[PDB]
Design a protein around this ligand. Structure first.
Ligand SMILES: Cc1cc2nc3c(=O)[nH]c(=O)nc-3n(C[C@H](O)[C@H](O)[C@H](O)COP(=O)(O)O)c2cc1C
Ligand code: SF4
Ligand code: SF4
Ligand code: SF4
Ligand code: FES
Ligand code: FES
Lengths: 178, 240, 437, 127
């Protein structure tokens, strides 16, 4: 996987001391994740060999965080924040509706092949709750039913999120509720 | 040397001593799961908890005697009602998810968990009160069981109490990190992506594991710990 | 007015969030045209590291990560000369609920933080710094990398800064979404490439940190606040807040309120002022408030509470604490049982597992008690059990995560044990009204 | 309530599904643990249809890629749980009357379980 990009390896390992190469496991894992959708044992062995430690160590590291997926995920892995604020904004009913409509569990993916679901803790934007993240992108905030369904249909028709029309206004650091 | 007092007794003790070792050097006792001889103590089981005074100036919270250094003229309390109550509670937390295998467990009579349980647990609360053994009435952790990690070692991830002994050893003493935890929270379990167990010293984790998680495949289901006759001798396979 | 800043007095100067929101605020040219880097440029050649440490010690700047340790005396613990390389660590992992203040600093005004880190690194003789950001903030990370690229291009991060014999450079490190990685000793492991389990503290990070080097870790808000301090007075900074809570603070609020969000306000503003004047007043009747972060104990919605100044002392003497200033209002429409339900399930998800007490008791026991209660299965026996469980976890863990889990439930019982016993004795699930549109 | 009986029946049903997938795909299935309330029951009666509490699907190397468990006969908050090791993936199935076995609100069909197991095999299985 990293055979292709040795310049990226040099760039990331140069960020860390020569004896601290094992630091680079994080950026290497993150590149594999964001590029292929999920982390394979081969990716973990390669990270280990490049970074100078054991595949067991690298697997222990990788399996420590929630972001790292070890099973295939759909083109859009909906990470739904369920923490207290977002629940007080209805994250419960949001997750219930999404999961029941799509018919998917957190581990599996829609038969369409582009929709996976997952719960996540505080995304650090509570004033604009409820919150959802799509696989790398700045949160789709102020999640109402209409905003959710519009994002859903837009992604269903292949429109790139960065250019999708989103009803309603989302405050930057403060937001007026009416 | 450093002057310590354990609950009624006075001890001379070298400066770099652990509070736990000062305790046992005074002849007292305290639960012990995470720490091990020749291994780095790190407070994980939180079993070695004692009281410390350094003036009457008692510390606010209990000191982990395994990772607490000793200071000159320090008081250590292992008999306080609160100390024994906390010991029993930690024992209960450790027993929370255990698989109920004692009779069929190859760890048999010599299980540190069993013994520290019967030593320190079920503190005397105050009559002929009818007491309860377990308060936890929910589903226990159920994970992979009796998994051969190698031709010599079997792994019961349910019996693991998530101390650090085996991974700590693997990192420190042989220098072969061929065992580590995978997930976190209560989902933590021991695994490896180096499956053969390459290290030529893997079998010691079987002796170290305070529970029946890591057991000896070459001697599995042969006899119970007390039943065996022990012949202490020396190995003549090589000149060490 | 008699000189003390405790609110909307007109002599307060917006410094930190001033350029936040303005388009193109992340351009180095914007930062310069508004006077950026002047403070670093002056201090690096004029003041010594001991002097910039004493300046913050005089400012009385306490840790903005939620602890509150005085950063001046904190820097006074560094070796201050050893020959070893030191590292300066920026903690951009903002994972506690109700706290969203550092996000927009990173997204819109990165060069302020960069200047503050240059100042702190000069203070602590750290020639390199790492900024460990959580893997959920990608816009902030892009803006930070871009700003660092800009500073490296135009010479603000270089071999020698501004002719003086000091050297400085920063490197970004993205995380992967684990709350425990915010604990400063687990963050070091996470970056180094281990599992993010905390280290043994008896060896302190001031004398042994990242790769053994004498590293110092500071909050993003702290480092950003270093720049105004050095720019226009330490007394100008100390002109805000109570006798023990000096300077300004970025308060943030969320919940059923008219306009939640971030407000850069002096220390001591009342809950009444914050919720009504700024947040526009609630939208529903509130049963309780969680002032500091998620970990802070909820206090009832009372007049004597709303009139209490948010500070490190007035909340202390009121039983709660001011951790991050992130207020969350809990209305009567949602059960406290359900609130602490979600709180304990989140803390159970985010435990690392090293401690048997935290791992097992929280992730198996406490969450299951709340489940039984709020699913219409609980008993008064269960409420008493849950009541007695907390002291066995609170006192003794390797890292305070266990305490941050038990304390909110502690205060929730102390103020609403009635609710728990009610839901138990009626075998009633928590109320489930429709909250989202 | 009386949901327990049909819960253990559907538990036996899910075990049958696991055995069938194992035989079809030629992958190892394992009965991991039996009921302590059946082992240590000496004279005490046992009304449950089966005595098996835990099972798993292990790859050629024996490391599991799919784990399934049921709550004991005497525990509170009875459920059935599924887990993908190394994937931080956990599922909690209940039984709703008339509908059937459901993960939350989403019906848990044999086809759903087969798709989940196939994905788990292809991703997690080392050999
Ligand atoms: C379990 C745990 C998690 C924490 N997570 C964070 C965090 O995510 N972000 C943060 O700024 N502080 C966090 N803290 C508090 C840190 O100690 C704080 O960032 C650090 O002390 C910075 O010091 P300062 O405020 O003086 O700059 C956490 C503390 C604990 C115990
Ligand atoms: S590990 Fe110890 S306590 Fe557990 S089943 Fe075996 S003998 Fe019993
Ligand atoms: S397998 Fe044994 S030695 Fe290893 S962590 Fe678990 S209880 Fe400790
Ligand atoms: S208190 Fe919990 S999160 Fe903290 S070190 Fe212990 S087990 Fe890990
Ligand atoms: S609670 Fe969901 S963003 Fe903080
Ligand atoms: S014995 Fe000290 S904590 Fe394990």
């Amino acid at each position: 996987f990293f055979d292709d990009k040795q310049d990226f390896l040099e760039e990331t390992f140069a960020k860390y001391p020569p004896e601290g190469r094992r630091a680079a496991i994080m950026p290497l894992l993150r590149r594999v994740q964001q590029e292929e959708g999920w982390i394979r044992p081969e990716r973990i062995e390669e990270i280990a060999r490049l970074v100078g430690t054991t595949p067991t160590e690298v697997m222990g590291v990788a399996s420590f965080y929630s972001y790292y997926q070890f099973v295939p995920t759909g083109k859009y892995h909906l990470q739904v924040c369920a923490t207290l604020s977002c629940k007080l904004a209805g994250a419960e009913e949001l997750w219930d509706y999404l999961t029941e409509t799509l018919g998917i569990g957190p581990g599996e993916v829609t038969p369409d092949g582009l929709f996976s679901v997952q719960k996540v803790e505080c995304l650090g934007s509570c004033h604009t709750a409820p919150v959802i993240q799509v696989n790398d992108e700045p949160y789709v905030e102020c999640v109402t039913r209409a905003r959710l369904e519009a994002l859903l249909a837009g992604l269903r028709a292949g429109k790139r999120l960065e250019e999708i029309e989103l009803p309603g206004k989302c405050g930057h650091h403060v937001h007026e509720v009416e | 040397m450093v002057r310590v007092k354990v609950n009624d007794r006075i001890v001379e003790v070298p400066p770099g001593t652990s509070v736990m070792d000062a305790v046992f050097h005074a002849g007292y006792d305290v639960p012990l799961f995470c720490s091990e001889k020749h291994l780095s103590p790190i407070g994980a089981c939180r079993m070695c908890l004692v009281r410390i005074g350094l003036p009457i100036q008692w510390q606010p919270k209990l000191a982990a005697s395994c990772v607490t250094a000793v200071a000159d003229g320090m008081v250590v309390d292992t008999l306080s009602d609160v100390v024994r109550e906390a010991q029993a509670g930690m024992v209960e937390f450790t027993l929370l998810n255990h698989p109920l295998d004692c009779p069929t467990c190859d760890k048999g009579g010599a299980c540190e968990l069993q013994d520290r349980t019967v030593e320190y647990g079920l503190y005397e609360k105050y009559p002929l009160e009818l007491p309860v053994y377990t308060r936890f009435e929910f589903t226990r952790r159920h994970v992979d069981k009796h998994h051969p990690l190698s031709p010599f070692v079997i792994l019961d991830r349910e019996r693991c109490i998530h101390c650090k002994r085996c991974v700590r050893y693997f990192e420190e003493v042989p220098g072969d990190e061929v065992l580590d935890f995978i997930e976190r929270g209560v989902h933590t379990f021991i695994g490896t992506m180096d499956f053969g167990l390459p290290s030529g010293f893997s079998g010691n984790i079987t002796d170290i594991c305070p529970v029946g998680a890591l057991l000896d495949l070459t001697a599995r289901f042969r006899a119970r710990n007390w039943e065996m006759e022990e012949t202490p001798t020396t190995c003549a396979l090589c000149p060490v | 007015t008699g000189p003390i800043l405790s609110g909307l007095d007109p002599r307060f100067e917006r410094t930190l969030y001033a350029h936040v929101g303005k388009e193109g605020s992340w351009t180095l040219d914007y930062y310069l045209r508004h006077g950026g880097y002047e403070t670093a440029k002056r201090v690096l050649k004029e003041k010594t590291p001991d002097e910039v440490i004493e300046e913050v010690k005089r400012s009385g700047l306490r840790g903005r990560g939620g602890a509150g340790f005085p950063t001046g005396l904190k820097w006074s613990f560094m070796p201050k000369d050893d020959g070893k390389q030191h590292y300066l660590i920026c903690n951009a992992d903002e994972s506690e609920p109700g706290s969203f203040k550092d996000r927009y600093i990173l997204e819109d005004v990165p060069h302020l933080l960069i200047e503050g880190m240059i100042l702190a690194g000069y203070a602590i003789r750290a020639t390199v710094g790492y900024i460990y950001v959580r893997g959920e903030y990608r816009r902030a990370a892009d803006r930070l990398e871009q700003a660092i690229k800009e500073a490296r291009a135009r010479g603000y991060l270089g071999k020698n800064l501004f002719g003086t014999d000091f050297s400085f450079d920063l490197h970004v490190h993205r995380g992967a979404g684990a709350y425990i990685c915010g604990e400063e000793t687990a963050l070091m492991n996470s970056l180094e490439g281990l599992r993010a389990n905390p280290r043994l503290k008896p060896p302190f990070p001031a004398q042994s940190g990242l790769w053994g080097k004498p590293t110092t870790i500071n909050n993003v808000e702290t480092l950003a606040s270093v720049v105004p301090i050095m720019e226009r007075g330490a007394d100008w900074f100390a002109q805000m807040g109570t006798e023990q809570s000096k300077g300004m603070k970025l308060y943030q609020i969320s919940g059923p309120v008219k306009r939640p969000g971030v407000y850069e306000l002096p220390m001591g503003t009342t809950f009444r002022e914050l919720i009504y004047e700024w947040a526009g007043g609630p939208l529903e009747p509130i049963q309780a408030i969680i002032p500091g972060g998620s970990s802070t104990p909820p206090l009832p919605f009372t007049e004597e509470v709303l009139d209490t100044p948010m500070s490190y002392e007035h909340l202390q003497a009121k039983g709660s604490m001011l951790g991050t200033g992130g207020v969350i209002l809990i209305p009567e429409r949602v059960s406290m049982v359900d609130a602490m339900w979600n709180l304990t399930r989140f803390y159970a998800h985010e435990s690392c597992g090293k401690c048997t007490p935290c791992r097992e008791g929280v992730a198996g026991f406490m969450v299951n008690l709340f489940a039984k209660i709020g699913t219409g299965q609980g008993e008064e026996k269960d409420v008493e059990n849950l009541e007695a469980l907390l002291p066995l976890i609170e006192g003794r863990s390797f890292c305070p995560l266990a305490d941050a889990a038990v304390w909110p439930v502690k205060g929730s019982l102390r103020h609403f044990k009635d609710q728990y016993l009610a839901l138990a004795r009626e075998k009633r699930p928590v109320p489930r009204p429709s909250l989202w549109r | 309530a009386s949901s327990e009986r049909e819960l253990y029946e559907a538990w036996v049903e899910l075990l049958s599904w696991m055995r069938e997938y194992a035989q079809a795909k030629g992958v190892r299935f394992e009965k991991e643990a039996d009921f302590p309330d059946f082992i240590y029951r000496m004279e005490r009666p046992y009304d449950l249809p089966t005595t098996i509490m835990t099972a798993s699907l292990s790859d050629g190397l024996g490391e599991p890629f799919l784990l399934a468990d049921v709550s004991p006969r005497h525990a509170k908050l009875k459920r059935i749980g599924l887990r993908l090791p190394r994937a931080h993936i956990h599922l909690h199935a209940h039984y709703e009357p008339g509908k059937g076995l459901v993960t939350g609100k989403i019906p848990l069909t044999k086809e759903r379980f087969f798709a989940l197991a196939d994905r788990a095999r292809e991703a997690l299985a080392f050999a």
